Amino acid sequence: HQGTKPPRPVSLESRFMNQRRYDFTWMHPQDKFCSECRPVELECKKMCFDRYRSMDYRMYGFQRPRIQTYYSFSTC
Amino acid sequence: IDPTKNQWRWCVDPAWYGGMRDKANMDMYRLMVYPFFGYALLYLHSRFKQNDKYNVFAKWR
Amino acid sequence: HYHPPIDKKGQVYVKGPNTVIERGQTWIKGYELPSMEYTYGPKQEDIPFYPRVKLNVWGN
Amino acid sequence: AYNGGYPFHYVVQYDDPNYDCEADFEFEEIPRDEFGVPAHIPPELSTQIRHTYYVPPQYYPFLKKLGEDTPELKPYTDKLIMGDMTYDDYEEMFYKFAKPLKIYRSRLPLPYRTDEEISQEKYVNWCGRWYSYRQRLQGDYYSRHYFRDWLIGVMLGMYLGNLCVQQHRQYRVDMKLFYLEAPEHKINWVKPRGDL
Amino acid sequence: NLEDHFDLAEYMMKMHNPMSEYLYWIAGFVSGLHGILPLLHSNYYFSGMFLPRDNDNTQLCDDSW
Amino acid sequence: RIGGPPVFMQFPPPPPKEYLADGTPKTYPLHQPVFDHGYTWEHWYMTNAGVFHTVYYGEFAKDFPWRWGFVAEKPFWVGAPILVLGVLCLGHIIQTMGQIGVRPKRYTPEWVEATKERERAENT
Amino acid sequence: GCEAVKNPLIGGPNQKARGAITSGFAGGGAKRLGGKGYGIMADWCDHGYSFTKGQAITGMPHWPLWCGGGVPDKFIKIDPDVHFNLQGYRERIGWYGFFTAFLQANYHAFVYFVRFIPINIAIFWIYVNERQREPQENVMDHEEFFRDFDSIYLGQVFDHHRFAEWLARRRAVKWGYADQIHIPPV
Amino acid sequence: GRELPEYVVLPHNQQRYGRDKSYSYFTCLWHFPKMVFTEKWCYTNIMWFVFWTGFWFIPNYIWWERRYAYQKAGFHWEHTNRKLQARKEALGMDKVPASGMDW
Amino acid sequence: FYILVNNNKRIGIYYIKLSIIIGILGIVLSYIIRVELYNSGNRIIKYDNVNYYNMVITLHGLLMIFYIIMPGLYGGIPLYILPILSVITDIVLPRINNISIIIVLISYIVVINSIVIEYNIGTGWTLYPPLSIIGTVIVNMILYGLIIIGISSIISAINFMNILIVIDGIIYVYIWSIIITSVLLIISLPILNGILLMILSDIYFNSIYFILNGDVVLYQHLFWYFGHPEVYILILPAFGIISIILSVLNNKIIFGMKSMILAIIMISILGSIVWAHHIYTVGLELDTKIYFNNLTLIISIPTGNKIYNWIILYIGSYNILYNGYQSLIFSIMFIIIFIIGGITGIIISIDIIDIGLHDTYYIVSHFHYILSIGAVISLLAGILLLKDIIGYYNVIIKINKYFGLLLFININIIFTPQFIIGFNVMPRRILEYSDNIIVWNLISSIGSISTILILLSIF
Ligand SMILES: CCCCCCCCCCCCCCCCCC(=O)OC[C@H](COP(=O)([O-])OCC(O)COP(=O)([O-])OC[C@@H](COC(=O)CCCCCCCCCCCCCCCCC)OC(=O)CCCCCCCCCCCCCCCCC)OC(=O)CCCCCCCCCCCCCCCCC
Ligand code: HEA
Ligand code: HEA
Ligand SMILES: [O-][O-]
Ligand SMILES: [Cu+2]
Ligand SMILES: [K+]
C-alpha cells in the first residue's frame, strides 16, 4: 500500500500553513544540506540534490526508478 | 571456598575489582583531561569570535 | 597494598573491658572521659547549676 | 508455598556415568530426580507415589537404641526401621527436636557500682516518681496559662484590625461624596491634547 | 587508621594547607566576575564606554557634570 | 558473615612521636591563633547539651581578631544602634559618589512648573 | 617488563615471581572440553561454544552466588595477592601492556556492541535501499485531482496492478526518463 | 606484623611548623600572592596547567580557523561549483563531464 | 580523592560549598539590579545595552532558584543528615549521589560560559514564548542547563525515596519533608521536561507550537504545573529544618507530629493543583478562575496549622537556656517572616486584587520575603545547628547578635518598600521608571548595599 500510495492534492497554503522562522538545518548544523527542504520531504531534496550534482558535488539517492530496484513494493 | 580469602570484596571498591585492567581504564581517561580542556576552550573561542566580541574596541576606534 | 585484615579464623583484634571481680561478682568499670579542662582548657569549677527536669510536656 | 513450589536447590541424577549436561548435545538421556523418578513422569503424579527411606538392616539396632533412650523419638525411629518414613516424616522428626539457644543473665558482668550506691536504689526511684508527678501537673498548669494568653493576642489583633475597619468605613463615606459634592470633581474640563 | 576516622581530617584537625581556602574564595570571586565583566564589555560594545554617567541618556543642564 | 566487612575494628596505635635533634617535641601546623590585642573579655552561655544536660560555653577574646574583640566588648544596645545607622549612611554615600554634580533638566524649577500646569489641565 | 607480559600464560606456576596476571580467565576444573567446571570461565578467546566447530569449549558459568559457590584451590588461576598490589604495575606491563589492559578492561562493552550492532545494520539497510529509489509522487495538482477524484482516490483498491503501472508511467513523465525505460505491460 | 619504636629523634633541629601567627582582615591580600609566586609547588602546578591547556588548544585552534574561513567562503557545493566554472573556462567548454567521469 | 568521593556526608558539604560559590554570582546580579534601580536614568547599564539587564534578571532568578537554594536545602542538608536520621550507614545509591553534584556543577559552567560567549539577552526566568523562541543562542544554552539540572534533581529524588526501603528507625518529620518533596519532583519534572522540549523544538526544529493557531498559553499551563510545585519543593525542606531546630533547642518534643506530617502531605497535593493562579490575567474562564482561587486559599489551612504548632514549641521553654544563639534566632525569625510572605500570597490569590498586583514589585517582595529571607535564613539556621557535626570554622556566626539584627533590618528595608510601589504602580522586569517612584526604589537600593556589607563581617 505504501509502495503505491495514491497521489493527493497539493495543499493550498492556508492562513497558518508552512510558517518558517529560519531554515531547516538541525540535521546538518555545519553542512546545511537542503536548508529549504523539510527533514523528510523527499521530492524537494531530490531537486536540491540535482542542483548540487550540477554544481559538481555528489549526493546519494533519488536516481534509480522504483520499478528497477529490489524491495520497492511498487512492481506490477 | 575459604570464606576469609575473599576480603578483597570489601577491601577494594567494585570499580577496581579488575586489578590493572580497571586501573588502566581509569588512567587512560585521565590522560584525556587536558586535551578536553583545549577542545572546550576552543568552543568558547569559536562562539566568542562568531559574535564579534573581539571587535569591541576596534568597533569604536 | 592489598592486605586483608581478618585472619584465618575470621577474627580481628578486640580490646577487652576493664574487669574487676569483687563481692562475688565480676564487674566492668567503664571508661570515663578526661576532664574537660584537659580537652577544652577552662578549669571545671564554679559551674552553674542546671537541675534534672523531665520533659516539658503540654497537659490536659 | 515459595517460588511456586520449585525448590531453590534440588538433586538430579543421570544414568550414564560419563554424562555432562553442558558438554554433550545428545537428545536421548532423561534426567531423574532425587528419589529416582524419571523426568518424563510429571510431578503431579510422582509426588502422589509414596517414597520411603530404606537404610541397610545393619542400622536397625542403632535406630532401636535411639528410640529407647529417647521415647519421644521412638515412633519416628520405628517408622524408619519399618520403611514407612517419608521425607515429610523425617522433617517432622527434625524440627520436633530442635531447641532454642539459652542466655543466662547470671553470667553477665555488671557495670561497677559500690555497695553504698546499691543501697540508694529506692531513693533514686523515689526521686524519679516525684519528677514525673511534678512534670504531669505542670503540663496542665502551663497549657491553661499559655492557651489563655493566646486570647490576649486575639483581642489585640481584633483591636488593631478594627482600626483599619474604621478607616475603611470613613473612606467609603468620603468616596460617596466625591462625585456628588467634591469641588475636586470637574466635568467638561479635560480637552484632547492632539497628536504632537 | 586514626587519621582516616574523620572525613577531611586535616581540615577538621586544623592542619590543612591554607591554599585550599584561598582557591575556594578565588573560585567564588571568579564566579562574581561573570556578572561584572560582561556588563562592561557589552556596554562598550554598544556604546563605546565601559560604564555610563548617571543620567547621560536624558537631557542635562548646561552646568551638569 | 565470615570474611565480610567487620562490624568493629580496633584502631592501630598512632605512629611514633617525632622529637627534634635537641629533644624538643616536633610541632605541627595548628590553625588556632592567639590573636594579639588588649581585649580580655570572657562571655559564657548556657547551651543545650542534649535533652537533660547543658554545657557552659565560653568565648574568649584572645580567640578572635581585634575587630571582633573590640565590637564584642561593648554593650549590644550601645553598638547595635550605631552600627545600624553607620551601615545605612555608608550605603547612601556609596550610591551618591557616581552622581556628584549630575543635574537633569527635568528636576529644574521650570520643568517642575510645567508638570503642575499639565496636572491642572488633566485634573490628575 | 615482567616475565608475565613477555610470556603470557593462563594459570602457570610461579605467578608471583612472574609479577603479573595477564589473563582474565577465572575457573576451570572441567574433566572434558565444554564440561561442568568451577568458576565463571570467561575470556576474549577460547571459551563458550564454538560456532565453526559446533562444540562447547567451556561449560556454563558457575556463579559465586546462591546458584553456585566457591572455586576449589586446585583450579584457581587469579590469585588476589598477585592480581592486586598494583604498586608500580605500569613499569611491569610497559606502554603496550597498558594499551592491552585498557582494551581488555572493556570486554563487557565489547560483548554488548557485538550483540547490538547487527539489528542497527538491518535498520540502516532499510534506509539505504529506500534512499536510492526515486521519490514517489506524493502530491499532484489540486484541481486535476478533484476533477478525477474517483479514479485517483479509489483506483488502488479496485485494481492495484494497473494503478501501480499508471503511477510508474507518471513518475517516468515527472522525471523525464519515459523514453529511456520500458514499463512492463500489465 | 611490624615493629616500631615509641618515638623517633629527627636529624634536624628546625621547628618548621606550629600555631598560626595572629592575622588581620587583609592578611590574605599579601600572603596569597606570596604563596603563588614564591612557593614552588604552587607555581609549578600553575605553569603545568597553563602549558598543557594551551598545548592542546593550538591544534584545535588551527583546525577550526581553517574550517571557519572555508565556511565563510561558501557551502561545500559552492566551492566545487567555483572549481567547475574554472575548468569550463580553461577548456572553453560550456558543459564538461562531472569530476571522476570521462567525456 | 576529591571528585571521586562517594561519601554521602562529603557530597552534602559539596552541595553547600557550590551553593555559596554560585550564590556569589547570584548576589552580584542582585546588586546590579538594585544599583540600576537607585534612580531614574541610566546608572550602570547603557540604554543601548538594556538587553543585559533583561539577562541579569533572568539569570538571577534561575540561578538562585535552581543552582543555589534548591541545591542547598534539597541537596546539601538532606545528603548530610538524612542517612543519619534514618540510622542507616550511608545513602542507598552511592554512585548516583556522586554524579548528581557533578551534574549541577557542569550545568552551572554551561550557563556562565553562555554569559561570556553568547549575546546577552533575557526573557525572564519563566521563559515565556514567543519571546523565548525568537531569541539568540543564549536561550538554547540556558535550556540545556535546565534539562541537565532536571536530570540531577530527579535522580536525587529517586535516591531519597529509597530510604523508605532501608530506614531502620522512625520517619521523623524532616524525613517526611524530604520524601514529599521527592514525590513532588517525580510528578512535576516529567511535565517540565516535555514543555522544555517543545520550546527547543520551536527554537531548533522549526516546530510551530508557539505561533498563530498554536496556543502560547499552553506553555504557561505546563510550565506552572511545575512552577508552583517548585516553590513548595523549595520551602518544604525548610519547614523540616525549622521543626528540628525548635524541638532540639527548646528541648521540647514536637507537638502534633502527625498533624505536621499530614500538613506537609496536604500542602503537596494542594500545591499540585493550584498552578493557574499564575495565569489569572491571561483570560481564563470564570469557573476555572474561581476553582483555582478557591483551592489556592485552601493551602493556607495546612500551612497555618504548621505555623501554630511551631509557636507552641518555642512557648514555655526554659528561661535559663541562652536564647541568643544564631540558629534559634533564625528559626524564630522564619516564623515572623514567613507569615508576612504567606499573608501577602493570600492577598494576591484573590484574582481581582491580582489584576492590579500582577507583574508588579508587590509580587517580587512577596516571594523574596519567603525565599530571599525565609529560605536563606532556614538554610543558615540548619547549617548553624550542625556546625559541630559538620565541623567548619573560621567564621563568627554561631553567636553574633549584630549579624542577625543587621540582616533582619536591612533585608526588610529592601523588600518592604517593594510592597508599596506595587500600588504606585511600578511594573516588574523593568529598569527605567517614572521619577515619582524614586523615593521607594532608592530606599530599597540603600538596603541592598547595606546587606552586602554585612556579609563581609562574618569572616
Ligand atoms: C554567600 C557568601 C557568604 C556566606 C557566609 C555564611 C557561611 C556560613 C558557613 C558555611 C560553611 C559550609 C560548610 C563548610 C565545610 C568546609 C569543609 C572544608 O574545609 O573542606 C576541606 C576542603 C579541602 O581541604 P583539604 O582536605 O586540605 O584538601 C586538600 C586538597 O584536596 C589537596 O591539596 P592540593 O594543594 O594538592 O590541592 C590541589 C590544588 C593545587 O592548587 C595549586 O597548585 C594552586 C596554585 C595557586 C593558584 C591560585 C589561583 C590563581 C588565580 C590566578 C588568576 C589570574 C587572573 C589574571 C587576570 C588578568 C586580567 C588582565 O588545586 C587544584 O589543583 C585545583 C583547584 C581547583 C579549584 C579552584 C578554582 C578557582 C577558580 C577557577 C576559575 C576558572 C575560570 C575559567 C574561565 C575560562 C573561560 C574561557 O577545604 C576547601 O576546599 C576550602 C574551603 C574553605 C571555606 C570553608 C568554609 C568556611 C566558612 C565560610 C567562609 C565564607 C566563604 C564565602 C564564600 C567565598 C567568597 C569568595
Ligand atoms: C517558596 C516560595 C513561595 C511560597 C511558600 C509561596 C506561597 C504562596 N504563594 Fe507564591 N510565589 C512565589 C513563591 C512562593 N509562593 C514566587 C517565586 C512567585 C512569582 C513567580 C513569578 O511570577 O515569576 C509567586 C507568585 C505567587 C502569585 C502570583 C501573583 C501574580 O503573578 O501576580 C500568587 C497568587 O496566587 C501566589 C500565591 C501564593 C499563596 C496563596 C501561597 C501560600 O503558600 C501562602 C500560605 C501561607 C500563609 C497563608 C501564611 C501562614 C498561614 C497562616 C498564618 C494561617 C492563617 C492565614 C489565613 C487563614 C489566610 N504566589
Ligand atoms: C531564592 C532565590 C532568590 C534570592 C536569594 C534572591 C535574593 C535577592 N533578590 Fe531576587 N529574585 C529571584 C530570586 C531570588 N532573589 C527571582 C526568582 C526573581 C524574578 C526573576 C525575574 O524577574 O525573571 C528575583 C527578582 C529580583 C529582582 C527584580 C528585578 C526585575 O525583574 O526587575 C530584584 C531587585 O529588585 C531582586 C533583588 C534581590 C536582592 C536584592 C536579593 C538578596 O541579595 C537580598 C539579600 C540577601 C542575601 C544577600 C543573602 C543571600 C544568600 C544566599 C542566597 C546564599 C545562601 C547559601 C547558603 C546559606 C549555604 N530579585
Ligand atoms: O507560586 O506561589
Ligand atoms: Cu504559584
Ligand atoms: K535606572
PDB file of N, CA, C and O in Angstrom, chain I residues 361-393:
ATOM      1  N   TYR I 361       6.029  44.991  41.571  1.00  0.00           N
ATOM      2  CA  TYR I 361       7.038  44.642  42.565  1.00  0.00           C
ATOM      3  C   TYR I 361       6.435  44.112  43.860  1.00  0.00           C
ATOM      4  O   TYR I 361       7.183  43.625  44.713  1.00  0.00           O
ATOM      5  N   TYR I 362       5.115  44.189  44.027  1.00  0.00           N
ATOM      6  CA  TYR I 362       4.470  43.518  45.151  1.00  0.00           C
ATOM      7  C   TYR I 362       4.691  42.011  45.080  1.00  0.00           C
ATOM      8  O   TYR I 362       4.946  41.365  46.103  1.00  0.00           O
ATOM      9  N   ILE I 363       4.595  41.435  43.881  1.00  0.00           N
ATOM     10  CA  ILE I 363       4.874  40.012  43.718  1.00  0.00           C
ATOM     11  C   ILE I 363       6.322  39.718  44.073  1.00  0.00           C
ATOM     12  O   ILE I 363       6.629  38.720  44.734  1.00  0.00           O
ATOM     13  N   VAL I 364       7.237  40.580  43.627  1.00  0.00           N
ATOM     14  CA  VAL I 364       8.651  40.426  43.961  1.00  0.00           C
ATOM     15  C   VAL I 364       8.822  40.327  45.470  1.00  0.00           C
ATOM     16  O   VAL I 364       9.317  39.324  45.998  1.00  0.00           O
ATOM     17  N   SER I 365       8.397  41.365  46.188  1.00  0.00           N
ATOM     18  CA  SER I 365       8.540  41.373  47.639  1.00  0.00           C
ATOM     19  C   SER I 365       7.896  40.146  48.270  1.00  0.00           C
ATOM     20  O   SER I 365       8.405  39.610  49.261  1.00  0.00           O
ATOM     21  N   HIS I 366       6.779  39.682  47.710  1.00  0.00           N
ATOM     22  CA  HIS I 366       6.106  38.515  48.275  1.00  0.00           C
ATOM     23  C   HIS I 366       7.020  37.298  48.269  1.00  0.00           C
ATOM     24  O   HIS I 366       7.236  36.670  49.311  1.00  0.00           O
ATOM     25  N   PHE I 367       7.581  36.954  47.110  1.00  0.00           N
ATOM     26  CA  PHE I 367       8.383  35.741  47.044  1.00  0.00           C
ATOM     27  C   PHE I 367       9.801  35.946  47.560  1.00  0.00           C
ATOM     28  O   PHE I 367      10.476  34.961  47.872  1.00  0.00           O
ATOM     29  N   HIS I 368      10.257  37.192  47.684  1.00  0.00           N
ATOM     30  CA  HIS I 368      11.533  37.438  48.348  1.00  0.00           C
ATOM     31  C   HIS I 368      11.425  37.197  49.848  1.00  0.00           C
ATOM     32  O   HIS I 368      12.293  36.554  50.448  1.00  0.00           O
ATOM     33  N   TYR I 369      10.364  37.712  50.472  1.00  0.00           N
ATOM     34  CA  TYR I 369      10.177  37.500  51.902  1.00  0.00           C
ATOM     35  C   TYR I 369      10.173  36.020  52.251  1.00  0.00           C
ATOM     36  O   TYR I 369      10.621  35.636  53.336  1.00  0.00           O
ATOM     37  N   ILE I 370       9.684  35.175  51.344  1.00  0.00           N
ATOM     38  CA  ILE I 370       9.636  33.743  51.611  1.00  0.00           C
ATOM     39  C   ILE I 370      10.966  33.080  51.269  1.00  0.00           C
ATOM     40  O   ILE I 370      11.463  32.241  52.028  1.00  0.00           O
ATOM     41  N   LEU I 371      11.560  33.433  50.129  1.00  0.00           N
ATOM     42  CA  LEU I 371      12.775  32.779  49.652  1.00  0.00           C
ATOM     43  C   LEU I 371      14.037  33.533  50.063  1.00  0.00           C
ATOM     44  O   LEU I 371      14.895  32.986  50.763  1.00  0.00           O
ATOM     45  N   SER I 372      14.162  34.788  49.630  1.00  0.00           N
ATOM     46  CA  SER I 372      15.385  35.543  49.882  1.00  0.00           C
ATOM     47  C   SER I 372      15.616  35.764  51.369  1.00  0.00           C
ATOM     48  O   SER I 372      16.763  35.934  51.798  1.00  0.00           O
ATOM     49  N   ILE I 373      14.552  35.784  52.163  1.00  0.00           N
ATOM     50  CA  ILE I 373      14.645  35.931  53.612  1.00  0.00           C
ATOM     51  C   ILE I 373      14.379  34.603  54.310  1.00  0.00           C
ATOM     52  O   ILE I 373      15.219  34.105  55.061  1.00  0.00           O
ATOM     53  N   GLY I 374      13.212  34.007  54.066  1.00  0.00           N
ATOM     54  CA  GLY I 374      12.821  32.827  54.820  1.00  0.00           C
ATOM     55  C   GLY I 374      13.660  31.606  54.496  1.00  0.00           C
ATOM     56  O   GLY I 374      14.188  30.946  55.394  1.00  0.00           O
ATOM     57  N   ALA I 375      13.786  31.277  53.209  1.00  0.00           N
ATOM     58  CA  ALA I 375      14.522  30.076  52.830  1.00  0.00           C
ATOM     59  C   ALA I 375      16.006  30.214  53.137  1.00  0.00           C
ATOM     60  O   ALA I 375      16.630  29.276  53.647  1.00  0.00           O
ATOM     61  N   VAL I 376      16.589  31.375  52.837  1.00  0.00           N
ATOM     62  CA  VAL I 376      18.001  31.604  53.123  1.00  0.00           C
ATOM     63  C   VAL I 376      18.270  31.432  54.612  1.00  0.00           C
ATOM     64  O   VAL I 376      19.202  30.730  55.021  1.00  0.00           O
ATOM     65  N   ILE I 377      17.452  32.076  55.441  1.00  0.00           N
ATOM     66  CA  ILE I 377      17.639  32.024  56.888  1.00  0.00           C
ATOM     67  C   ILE I 377      17.461  30.601  57.399  1.00  0.00           C
ATOM     68  O   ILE I 377      18.141  30.176  58.340  1.00  0.00           O
ATOM     69  N   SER I 378      16.543  29.846  56.795  1.00  0.00           N
ATOM     70  CA  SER I 378      16.337  28.460  57.204  1.00  0.00           C
ATOM     71  C   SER I 378      17.558  27.607  56.891  1.00  0.00           C
ATOM     72  O   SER I 378      17.961  26.767  57.702  1.00  0.00           O
ATOM     73  N   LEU I 379      18.149  27.798  55.710  1.00  0.00           N
ATOM     74  CA  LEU I 379      19.367  27.080  55.357  1.00  0.00           C
ATOM     75  C   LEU I 379      20.516  27.467  56.279  1.00  0.00           C
ATOM     76  O   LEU I 379      21.268  26.604  56.746  1.00  0.00           O
ATOM     77  N   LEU I 380      20.662  28.763  56.555  1.00  0.00           N
ATOM     78  CA  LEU I 380      21.672  29.217  57.504  1.00  0.00           C
ATOM     79  C   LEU I 380      21.440  28.610  58.879  1.00  0.00           C
ATOM     80  O   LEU I 380      22.371  28.107  59.517  1.00  0.00           O
ATOM     81  N   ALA I 381      20.193  28.645  59.349  1.00  0.00           N
ATOM     82  CA  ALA I 381      19.879  28.100  60.663  1.00  0.00           C
ATOM     83  C   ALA I 381      20.183  26.612  60.728  1.00  0.00           C
ATOM     84  O   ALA I 381      20.673  26.112  61.746  1.00  0.00           O
ATOM     85  N   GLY I 382      19.887  25.883  59.652  1.00  0.00           N
ATOM     86  CA  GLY I 382      20.159  24.455  59.644  1.00  0.00           C
ATOM     87  C   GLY I 382      21.644  24.147  59.669  1.00  0.00           C
ATOM     88  O   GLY I 382      22.099  23.279  60.418  1.00  0.00           O
ATOM     89  N   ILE I 383      22.420  24.855  58.848  1.00  0.00           N
ATOM     90  CA  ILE I 383      23.870  24.679  58.849  1.00  0.00           C
ATOM     91  C   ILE I 383      24.440  25.045  60.213  1.00  0.00           C
ATOM     92  O   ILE I 383      25.311  24.351  60.749  1.00  0.00           O
ATOM     93  N   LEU I 384      23.947  26.137  60.795  1.00  0.00           N
ATOM     94  CA  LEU I 384      24.425  26.580  62.100  1.00  0.00           C
ATOM     95  C   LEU I 384      24.158  25.539  63.179  1.00  0.00           C
ATOM     96  O   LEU I 384      24.990  25.332  64.070  1.00  0.00           O
ATOM     97  N   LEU I 385      22.995  24.889  63.128  1.00  0.00           N
ATOM     98  CA  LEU I 385      22.691  23.845  64.099  1.00  0.00           C
ATOM     99  C   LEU I 385      23.674  22.691  63.989  1.00  0.00           C
ATOM    100  O   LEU I 385      24.028  22.071  64.998  1.00  0.00           O
ATOM    101  N   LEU I 386      24.122  22.387  62.773  1.00  0.00           N
ATOM    102  CA  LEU I 386      25.024  21.276  62.514  1.00  0.00           C
ATOM    103  C   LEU I 386      26.480  21.711  62.450  1.00  0.00           C
ATOM    104  O   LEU I 386      27.300  21.016  61.843  1.00  0.00           O
ATOM    105  N   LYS I 387      26.818  22.847  63.055  1.00  0.00           N
ATOM    106  CA  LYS I 387      28.191  23.331  62.983  1.00  0.00           C
ATOM    107  C   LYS I 387      29.158  22.339  63.614  1.00  0.00           C
ATOM    108  O   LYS I 387      30.220  22.053  63.051  1.00  0.00           O
ATOM    109  N   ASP I 388      28.809  21.803  64.784  1.00  0.00           N
ATOM    110  CA  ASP I 388      29.685  20.833  65.433  1.00  0.00           C
ATOM    111  C   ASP I 388      29.808  19.561  64.608  1.00  0.00           C
ATOM    112  O   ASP I 388      30.903  19.007  64.467  1.00  0.00           O
ATOM    113  N   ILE I 389      28.693  19.080  64.058  1.00  0.00           N
ATOM    114  CA  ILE I 389      28.726  17.846  63.282  1.00  0.00           C
ATOM    115  C   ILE I 389      29.472  18.063  61.970  1.00  0.00           C
ATOM    116  O   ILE I 389      30.315  17.250  61.575  1.00  0.00           O
ATOM    117  N   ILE I 390      29.173  19.160  61.276  1.00  0.00           N
ATOM    118  CA  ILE I 390      29.868  19.454  60.028  1.00  0.00           C
ATOM    119  C   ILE I 390      31.333  19.768  60.298  1.00  0.00           C
ATOM    120  O   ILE I 390      32.232  19.231  59.640  1.00  0.00           O
ATOM    121  N   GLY I 391      31.596  20.637  61.266  1.00  0.00           N
ATOM    122  CA  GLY I 391      32.945  20.909  61.708  1.00  0.00           C
ATOM    123  C   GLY I 391      33.627  22.113  61.096  1.00  0.00           C
ATOM    124  O   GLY I 391      34.835  22.275  61.286  1.00  0.00           O
ATOM    125  N   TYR I 392      32.901  22.959  60.373  1.00  0.00           N
ATOM    126  CA  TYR I 392      33.512  24.137  59.782  1.00  0.00           C
ATOM    127  C   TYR I 392      33.816  25.182  60.852  1.00  0.00           C
ATOM    128  O   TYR I 392      33.197  25.220  61.918  1.00  0.00           O
ATOM    129  N   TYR I 393      34.788  26.036  60.555  1.00  0.00           N
ATOM    130  CA  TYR I 393      35.198  27.095  61.468  1.00  0.00           C
ATOM    131  C   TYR I 393      35.699  28.272  60.637  1.00  0.00           C
ATOM    132  O   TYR I 393      35.414  28.366  59.437  1.00  0.00           O
TER     133      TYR I 393
END
